[PDB]
Amino acid sequence: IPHTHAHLVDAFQALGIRAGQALMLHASVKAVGAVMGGPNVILQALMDALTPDGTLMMYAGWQDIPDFIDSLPDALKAVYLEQHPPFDPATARAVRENSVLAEFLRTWPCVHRSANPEASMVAVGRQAALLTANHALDYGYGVESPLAKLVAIEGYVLMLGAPLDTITLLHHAEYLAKMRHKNVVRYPCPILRDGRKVWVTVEDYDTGDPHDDYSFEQIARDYVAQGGGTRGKVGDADAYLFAAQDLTRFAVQWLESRFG
Amino acid sequence: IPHTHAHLVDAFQALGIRAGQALMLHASVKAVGAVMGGPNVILQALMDALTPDGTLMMYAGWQDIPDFIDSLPDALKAVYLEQHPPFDPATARAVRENSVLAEFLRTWPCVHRSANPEASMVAVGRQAALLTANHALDYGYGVESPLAKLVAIEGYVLMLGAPLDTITLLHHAEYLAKMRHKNVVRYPCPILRDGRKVWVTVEDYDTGDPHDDYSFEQIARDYVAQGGGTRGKVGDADAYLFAAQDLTRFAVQWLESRFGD
Amino acid sequence: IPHTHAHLVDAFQALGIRAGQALMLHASVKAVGAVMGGPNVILQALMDALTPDGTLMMYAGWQDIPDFIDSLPDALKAVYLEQHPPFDPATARAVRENSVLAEFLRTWPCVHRSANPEASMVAVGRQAALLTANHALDYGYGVESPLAKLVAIEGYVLMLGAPLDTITLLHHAEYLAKMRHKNVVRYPCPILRDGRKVWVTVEDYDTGDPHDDYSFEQIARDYVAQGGGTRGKVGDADAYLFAAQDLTRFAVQWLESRFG
Amino acid sequence: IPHTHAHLVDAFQALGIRAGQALMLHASVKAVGAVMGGPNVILQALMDALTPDGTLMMYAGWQDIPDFIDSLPDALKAVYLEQHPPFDPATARAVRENSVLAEFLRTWPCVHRSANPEASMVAVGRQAALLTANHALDYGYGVESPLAKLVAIEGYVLMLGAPLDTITLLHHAEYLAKMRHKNVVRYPCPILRDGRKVWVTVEDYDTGDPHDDYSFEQIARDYVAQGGGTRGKVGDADAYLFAAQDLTRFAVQWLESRFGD
Numbered sequence A, C: 001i002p003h004t005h006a007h008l009v010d011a012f013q014a015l016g017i018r019a020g021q022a023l024m025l026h027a028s029v030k031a032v033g034a035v036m037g038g039p040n041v042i043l044q045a046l047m048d049a050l051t052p053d054g055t056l057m058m059y060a061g062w063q064d065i066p067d068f069i070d071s072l073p074d075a076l077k078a079v080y081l082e083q084h085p086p087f088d089p090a091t092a093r094a095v096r097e098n099s100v101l102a103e104f105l106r107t108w109p110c111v112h113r114s115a116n117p118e119a120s121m122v123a124v125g126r127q128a129a130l131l132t133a134n135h136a137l138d139y140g141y142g143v144e145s146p147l148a149k150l151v152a153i154e155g156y157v158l159m160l161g162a163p164l165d166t167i168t169l170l171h172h173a174e175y176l177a178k179m180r181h182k183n184v185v186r187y188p189c190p191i192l193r194d195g196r197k198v199w200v201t202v203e204d205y206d207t208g209d210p211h212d213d214y215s216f217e218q219i220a221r222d223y224v225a226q227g228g229g230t231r232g233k234v235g236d237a238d239a240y241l242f243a244a245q246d247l248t249r250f251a252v253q254w255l256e257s258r259f260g
Numbered sequence B, D: 001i002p003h004t005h006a007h008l009v010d011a012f013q014a015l016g017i018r019a020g021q022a023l024m025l026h027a028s029v030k031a032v033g034a035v036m037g038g039p040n041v042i043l044q045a046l047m048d049a050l051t052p053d054g055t056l057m058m059y060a061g062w063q064d065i066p067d068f069i070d071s072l073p074d075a076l077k078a079v080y081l082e083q084h085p086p087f088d089p090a091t092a093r094a095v096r097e098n099s100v101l102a103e104f105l106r107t108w109p110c111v112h113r114s115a116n117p118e119a120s121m122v123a124v125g126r127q128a129a130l131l132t133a134n135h136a137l138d139y140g141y142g143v144e145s146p147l148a149k150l151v152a153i154e155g156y157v158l159m160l161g162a163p164l165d166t167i168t169l170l171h172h173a174e175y176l177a178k179m180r181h182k183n184v185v186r187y188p189c190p191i192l193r194d195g196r197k198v199w200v201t202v203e204d205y206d207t208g209d210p211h212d213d214y215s216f217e218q219i220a221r222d223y224v225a226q227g228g229g230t231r232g233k234v235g236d237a238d239a240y241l242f243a244a245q246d247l248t249r250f251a252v253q254w255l256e257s258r259f260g261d
């Protein structure tokens, strides 16, 4: 029997999902196992557990962001500058490695999408506009970001068979933490401005690799080991539910004590 | 006979105010009628309907802003430059014509205040810091303003016996709208910088008079006439509740269709 | 006798015109009086005093710009939108009020014309391409204008019997000056884009009326009174030669001290 | 015994320096040897050979540009962002490796200085304003730069005892040349905007190291070998005089023949 909508709603509630929460999801469709109706039902079941008074958010980003063009031969870079489409929030596809579920939520009715191409988040529910509003282009995991707002409203992160190393929220802890040295990246990206394509430079902390000798999986496992979060099964998947505020506080302290 | 806290909470909920909303208030104490406990109870009842996870904001401005000193004679202007106090967000009083309720909210526990003196907004609640953060000095009703943020987070405007012409949000619609004519003003203002008084010049669109042949009352009356918002009584006052995003969109289209490209 | 080429050259040199200068001209043919060979000889004599290493520029604009159509009834506005020709820099005639000399210079061999229709400038000589390049559509008397470049390369303005109120350079001073009140206008204009007519909206400061209680005649006469420029006769005309940088600096200070 | 103004003027003229030319100088004071009156007289003799109808330019840059702060510990970077002064063109000192002569010219009467901090050029003479005008912040050795204008007005470059590897003009050839790959740098810099310090990001091609397996010394030596320029002694210094237009054309073809795609 493929997992049903009802069995998923009930499992989310059993794990601790409650009406009105703001929740960021990381998931693996394959870890959940076959669902009756496909991955839509994972999203709908989670939405139903949250009710319309709650909010569901995922990290979408942009699968085709051409942030790498300075490494290309100059003549090819020039073609990119002429021919590559800009980030259009209506069409820019989600990063495939963020789960097909992120692309499914990005194209969900009543979705809101944040404006930072590389860090773009999508949300559905009562606080979806709030979470995705005024997402600054520079330092997209920092103070002017959906992650800051998720912490401020005491939201949650649900890991649904997704590896612990993929928690995007810990990039916000990296932004906050006073560390010996953090790597800054400056990269090009085409956006829409007054309906026309414009290439801009985006400045951010590196989010492709850690700033020092740590991993997100290590921080998350240490968090679990000292009693943080709840754990349970949802479909076939091992699931973890974390409070965003407590996990961010823990991770900032973890980073500053080891690398400050 | 005076309106009670409970009856005000019920009236706000009947109008459509819900837990967690971000709400900007324009109000007349006299229009509401006598409240048991005074105007504090209007603010508290509204906060209670919003809950601490909602947010209540008002336009405070600065009652004593000396933005007029350029039209004084040189000798008097010199006295102002020397003697007028700077905008101190801890003490600068709210504009009296913004209702005593704005000054009451400005002095409420856990209030946050935006840094633009002339355009200063005050808020209490979960998004109060968010709404009031990084309020740019120039174009204070524009893209870096609490009004832009109220629109972005899909907040609301509540008119509680206040004239429709007083909706500050429509200055943000003026900022957004592409119009054949705009008046740009530069005016002086004393502020605090590194703990010291410094006189600066602020640039903004004129918000004292319209940029063309319209009024805010007209726009708002037209919005209501085509079904915008909800209406209901709160105390003795006729109240209107508007979605900030829908009203701004309507007002921008209204201005652009009449004066636009 | 009509004035000769040789006597005009001598008069220009006596006034202070030197080889290699970049010069913007405002002129009245009638004030100069009849010239042997007509107004062509005024331009050629000036070009000869400047030599090919100098540059001569004038304000052309567009005599037929339909910037007034938004105020017409819909039915007439519609006809303008469909039937009025776009700004074609090869054919768009200079504003007649700018002197026939501006249209004569616009049609001179080796002329360069700037792309802003309402603010269009025409130039012949060594820096003609430099002065007329990349003239932005918005704020056409501003930072991206031939007037800004004339100031930046320390060019000159020659008034050849033209009223001081007609100095276009003082609109650049208005743009630069920090003033208590500015009128900003948006108006329609047909242009060519990829060889097709397209209607665009242009944003600019109002240049039809001052922004406050002043006139250009007032500013320039004050400049002359404090020793600015040199004066002399050219033909029958009273002529004034101003340094573009010094006049702009003076006018900005004049505006800011009174309205800033 | 020390070299005199008159002998320096003649030595410059012997190379081909003429009245009215626009000339960019690279120099070593030590290579020239002691001059009667010091390095001022080198500049004045060159100016006198060029006459007031000519123009003299040097690369000043900014000795204290804090373009390296991202490599510092975060806490030290934070101090720089707060405390390091911005580029003020009235005071920012010339890079010392560009010769004390560049700082001497930067402080010369009637000097003009271009606005790009890292690439800042200083010039005195008839076309000094033109050469230094509207120097773009990004790609400061490219199309909107003093080097582009020096090429356009058919100016010259004089190497006065300076190593051929230090010719700034060849960074403009690097900018122009269609090469297989050029390294792009983006770096921070504090500037003045409306009288206040602002930190901005500057984008440019790398000018600290070549983009491929070449050196400027090698290009210039090849230019000389095929008959380009003139050479002679000025004081104790070996001098080279290059036409900017011909050298830029030669260098672009040189780079594209060897490293193009």
Ligand SMILES: CC(C)(COP(=O)(O)OP(=O)(O)OC[C@H]1O[C@@H](n2cnc3c(N)ncnc32)[C@H](O)[C@@H]1OP(=O)(O)O)[C@@H](O)C(=O)NCCC(=O)NCCS
Residues within 6 Å of the ligand: A025, A026, A027, A028, A029, A030, A031, A038, A039, A059, A096, A097, A098, A099, A100, A101, A161, A162, A163, A166, A167, A168
């Ligand atoms: C990388 C990772 C997503 C891979 O997980 P996964 O289960 O293999 O991949 P997805 O969740 O995208 O599911 C894909 C499956 O959905 C299924 N599916 C069901 N209906 C589908 C449909 N209409 N269209 C496409 N796929 C569909 C398919 O079986 C597909 O697998 P297939 O192409 O092999 O046939 C996962 O291990 C992970 O890391 N999750 C966390 C990711 C994250 O949040 N990163 C944030 C960056 S900070």
Ligand SMILES: CC(C)(COP(=O)(O)OP(=O)(O)OC[C@H]1O[C@@H](n2cnc3c(N)ncnc32)[C@H](O)[C@@H]1OP(=O)(O)O)[C@@H](O)C(=O)NCCC(=O)NCCS
Residues within 6 Å of the ligand: B025, B026, B027, B028, B029, B030, B031, B038, B039, B059, B096, B097, B098, B099, B100, B101, B161, B162, B163, B166, B167, B168
């Ligand atoms: C102008 C306007 C405020 C007048 O409304 P109002 O009801 O007369 O005035 P207020 O709301 O300030 O209420 C004043 C009353 O509060 C009462 N009050 C109760 N307790 C009070 C107290 N401790 N202290 C002071 N006043 C008190 C008083 O009776 C006072 O009236 P009084 O001084 O005549 O005795 C109203 O018509 C209006 O325009 N509101 C919208 C304004 C706005 O929001 N503008 C935004 C700018 S875009």
Ligand SMILES: CC(C)(COP(=O)(O)OP(=O)(O)OC[C@H]1O[C@@H](n2cnc3c(N)ncnc32)[C@H](O)[C@@H]1OP(=O)(O)O)[C@@H](O)C(=O)NCCC(=O)NCCS
Residues within 6 Å of the ligand: C025, C026, C027, C028, C029, C030, C031, C038, C039, C059, C096, C097, C098, C099, C100, C101, C162, C163, C166, C167, C168
């Ligand atoms: C308005 C102003 C141009 C009128 O000056 P003017 O001397 O009367 O007019 P012009 O310079 O255009 O000269 C016109 C004369 O050129 C003569 N002329 C000679 N050859 C001519 C020819 N081939 N074709 C046409 N006219 C010719 C004609 O006699 C003509 O006069 P007419 O039409 O009455 O017979 C002048 O007073 C002025 O203000 N100049 C400054 C304008 C300016 O620079 N504005 C900038 C905008 S900010």
Ligand SMILES: CC(C)(COP(=O)(O)OP(=O)(O)OC[C@H]1O[C@@H](n2cnc3c(N)ncnc32)[C@H](O)[C@@H]1OP(=O)(O)O)[C@@H](O)C(=O)NCCC(=O)NCCS
Residues within 6 Å of the ligand: D025, D026, D027, D028, D029, D030, D031, D038, D039, D059, D096, D097, D098, D099, D100, D101, D161, D162, D163, D166, D167, D168
């Ligand atoms: C690096 C380089 C400048 C060093 O040359 P240099 O002759 O040693 O140095 P300078 O030209 O700065 O001259 C310094 C000498 O000027 C002399 N001098 C005379 N008057 C002086 C004065 N008032 N103040 C300071 N120094 C003075 C001093 O002897 C000083 O040397 P010292 O400090 O050892 O006593 C030279 O080899 C070079 O590379 N020139 C090319 C520069 C260039 O254009 N770079 C741009 C790269 S694109």
Ligand SMILES: CN[C@@H]1[C@@H](O)[C@@H](O[C@@H]2[C@@H](O)[C@H](O[C@H]3OC(CN)=CC[C@H]3N)[C@@H](N)C[C@H]2N)OC[C@]1(C)O
Residues within 6 Å of the ligand: A065, A067, A118, A119, A165, A166, A167, A168, A206, A207, A208, A209, A210, A215, A216
């Ligand atoms: C398209 N260009 C890319 C650019 O979008 C950006 O992507 C980041 C991505 O790698 C991060 O995932 C890595 O890190 C984590 C935790 N250590 C585990 C999985 C790893 N893959 C992700 N959490 C956040 C993304 N912003 O940085 C890298 C890049 C190559 O430049």
Ligand SMILES: CN[C@@H]1[C@@H](O)[C@@H](O[C@@H]2[C@@H](O)[C@H](O[C@H]3OC(CN)=CC[C@H]3N)[C@@H](N)C[C@H]2N)OC[C@]1(C)O
Residues within 6 Å of the ligand: B065, B067, B118, B165, B166, B167, B168, B207, B208, B209, B210, B215, B216
């Ligand atoms: C202290 N100096 C003043 C300065 O603060 C500013 O005040 C503005 C105020 O008038 C506006 O209220 C007018 O607008 C209409 C709506 N059309 C409703 C009532 C009208 N009075 C208000 N909505 C916004 C304020 N920023 O401009 C004017 C000024 C005199 O300079």
Ligand SMILES: CN[C@@H]1[C@@H](O)[C@@H](O[C@@H]2[C@@H](O)[C@H](O[C@H]3OC(CN)=CC[C@H]3N)[C@@H](N)C[C@H]2N)OC[C@]1(C)O
Residues within 6 Å of the ligand: C065, C067, C118, C119, C165, C166, C167, C168, C207, C208, C209, C210, C215, C216
């Ligand atoms: C075609 N439509 C017109 C549009 O081109 C623009 O014309 C301007 C023109 O009037 C200005 O001349 C006035 O200014 C004073 C200087 N105080 C001298 C003479 C006055 N006539 C001129 N200097 C600059 C022009 N850009 O504005 C007005 C307009 C009607 O909209």
Ligand SMILES: CN[C@@H]1[C@@H](O)[C@@H](O[C@@H]2[C@@H](O)[C@H](O[C@H]3OC(CN)=CC[C@H]3N)[C@@H](N)C[C@H]2N)OC[C@]1(C)O
Residues within 6 Å of the ligand: D065, D067, D118, D119, D165, D166, D167, D168, D207, D208, D209, D210, D216
């Ligand atoms: C302050 N930071 C520095 C920044 O100003 C910039 O300096 C450049 C400078 O090195 C170049 O000189 C090198 O190259 C040449 C020919 N290959 C020979 C001498 C070499 N030293 C000079 N020609 C142009 C300068 N723009 O780049 C490097 C930097 C460290 O980032």
